[PDB]
Amino acid sequence: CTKIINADSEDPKYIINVKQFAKFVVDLSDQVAPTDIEEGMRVGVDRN
Amino acid sequence: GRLDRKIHIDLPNEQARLDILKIHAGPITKHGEIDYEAIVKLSDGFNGA
Amino acid sequence: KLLEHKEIDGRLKELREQLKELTKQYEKSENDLKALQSVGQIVGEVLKQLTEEKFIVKATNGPRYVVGCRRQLDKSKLKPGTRVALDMTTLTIMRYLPREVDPLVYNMSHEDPGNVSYSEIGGLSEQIRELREVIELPLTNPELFQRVGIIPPKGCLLYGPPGTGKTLLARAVASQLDCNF
Amino acid sequence: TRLLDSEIKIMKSEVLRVTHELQAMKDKIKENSEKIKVNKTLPYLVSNVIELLDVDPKCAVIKTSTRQTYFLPVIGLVDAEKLKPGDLVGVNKDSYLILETLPTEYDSRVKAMEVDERPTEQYSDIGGLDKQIQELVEAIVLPMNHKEKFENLGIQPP
Numbered sequence: 153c154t155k156i157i158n159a160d161s162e163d164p165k166y167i168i169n170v171k172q173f174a175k176f177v178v179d180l181s182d183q184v185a186p187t188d189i190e191e192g193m194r195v196g197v198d199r200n
Numbered sequence: 201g202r203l204d205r206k207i208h209i210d211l212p213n214e215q216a217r218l219d220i221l222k223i224h225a226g227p228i229t230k231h232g233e234i235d236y237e238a239i240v241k242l243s244d245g246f247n248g249a
Numbered sequence: 250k251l252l253e254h255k256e257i258d259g260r261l262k263e264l265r266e267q268l269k270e271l272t273k274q275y276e277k278s279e280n281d282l283k284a285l286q287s288v289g290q291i292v293g294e295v296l297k298q299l300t301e302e303k304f305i306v307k308a309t310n311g312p313r314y315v316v317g318c319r320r321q322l323d324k325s326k327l328k329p330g331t332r333v334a335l336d337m338t339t340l341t342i343m344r345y346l347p348r349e350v351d352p353l354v355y356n357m358s359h360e361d362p363g364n365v366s367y368s369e370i371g372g373l374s375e376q377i378r379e380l381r382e383v384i385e386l387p388l389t390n391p392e393l394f395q396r397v398g399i400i401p402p403k404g405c406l407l408y409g410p411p412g413t414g415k416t417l418l419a420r421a422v423a424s425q426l427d428c429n430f
Numbered sequence: 431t432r433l434l435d436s437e438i439k440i441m442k443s444e445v446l447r448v449t450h451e452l453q454a455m456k457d458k459i460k461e462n463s464e465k466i467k468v469n470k471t472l473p474y475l476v477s478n479v480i481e482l483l484d485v486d487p488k489c490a491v492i493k494t495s496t497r498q499t500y501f502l503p504v505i506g507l508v509d510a511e512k513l514k515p516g517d518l519v520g521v522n523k524d525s526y527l528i529l530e531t532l533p534t535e536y537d538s539r540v541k542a543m544e545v546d547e548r549p550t551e552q553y554s555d556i557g558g559l560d561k562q563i564q565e566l567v568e569a570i571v572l573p574m575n576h577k578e579k580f581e582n583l584g585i586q587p588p
């Protein structure tokens with residue numbers, strides 16, 4: 153579980169922050185719509 | 201040996217007040233006659249601000 | 250008359266104009282592919298050398314290692330305390346670097362778009378002289394105090410009621426003096 | 431001498447060869463672009479730039495978000511003219527090279543305090559505060575829409 157911090161337009165390219173590891177740039181999965189991805193709320197994240 | 205000099209910057213005097221007024225009231229587009237003496241007398245304990 | 254090649258010559262000229270951009274693109278692709286065949290190196294600090302080929306170095310973090318060095322590198326510059334770069338898979342000395350400068354100190358070094366001079370500040374023509382007696386004259390003509398037999402002071406502080414012109418005086422001094430600040 | 435067809439044939443052959451070379455170069459460029467786009471694996475590592483150090487025979491010194499200091503003999507895919515000490519950059523996870531530059535980030539608490547839904551209250555529903563309203567509006571709203579009335583006189587707003 154991680155926390156998104158912000159986003160950018162025309163491509164998801166979401167910035168993900170975690171408490172102990174580093175922060176990354178990521179995208180969604182296939183089955184999730186980009187509507188309910190509002191910033192500043194906890195999200196699930198793969199291990200790889 | 202650490203802070204050798206202590207410098208005091210007190211409130212302005214009448215001459216200092218007149219100097220600051222002449223510095224700051226210059227650029228404004230004034231008109232007519234101006235008398236700084238009354239302004240200096242009235243403003244007591246003021247600052248540059 | 251002799252324009253039998255003129256059309257073909259113009260076609261060749263247009264093709265050469267296109268080939269100019271095609272060669273710029275080939276060069277750009279070459280730089281892109283060449284750049285992506287390098288790796289970074291860890292940064293650490295040397296402590297001492299055990300023998301001719303063995304040093305002991307400390308990374309920025311904790312762990313300390315006993316490592317070797319490159320053969321062509323000079324060994325006369327590796328005094329204790331210097332900063333070195335090590336390989337990330339074998340941890341061998343590769344290069345020495347100059348001292349670090351913090352980004353905070355770099356930002357602090359130069360930030361002053363103001364250009365306030367001594368004409369915009371008035372009423373305290375004596376304290377300004379008292380302050381300039383400390384930081385200006387000794388830094389340029391230092392043999393006078395040595396002749397008299399004293400040492401000039403180091404620091405000073407300014408105090409008073411709020412809004413009497415302290416930060417303004419500091420800005421004027423910083424903006425009207427040619428020295429590191 | 432008289433006119434000869436040799437010039438026309440030579441020019442036509444040169445034009446055809448140059449066009450074919452341009453097509454081949456375009457194909458090679460497409461292949462190289464495909465290879466470059468293959469190396470852009472999406473997961474980056476956000477990091478901070480410490481120094482754009484200059485060396486002689488530009489090299490970067492960076493500080494990754496995982497508390498590791500790295501030295502890069504080459505910058506990467508981003509030009510060194512648009513980098514300052516303290517910039518935020520995305521770095522390849524393994525090769526550790528700069529891949530793109532990111533906008534400056536702000537704290538979530540700071541971002542959450544900006545208004546989104548404007549209130550619907552008007553000036554008409556406040557009674558007995560005319561002087562206060564006039565004194566407040568001439569110091570906040572006025573210096574925004576009527577700045578030309580100020581520098582024409584030489585007076586700074588409150």
Ligand SMILES: Nc1ncnc2c1ncn2[C@@H]1O[C@H](COP(=O)(O)OP(=O)(O)OP(=O)(O)O)[C@@H](O)[C@H]1O
Nearest residue numbers: 220248249369370371372411412413414415416417
């Ligand atoms: N002698 C002076 N001449 C002209 N302006 C002055 C003078 N003293 C103060 N001021 C005015 O003071 C304003 C800001 O003052 P300044 O920032 O120096 O405050 P201060 O005395 O350091 O107080 P504090 O830091 O405690 O708030 C300037 O914009 C300037 O107009």
Ligand SMILES: [Mg+2]
Nearest residue numbers: 412415416417
């Ligand atoms: Mg101040």
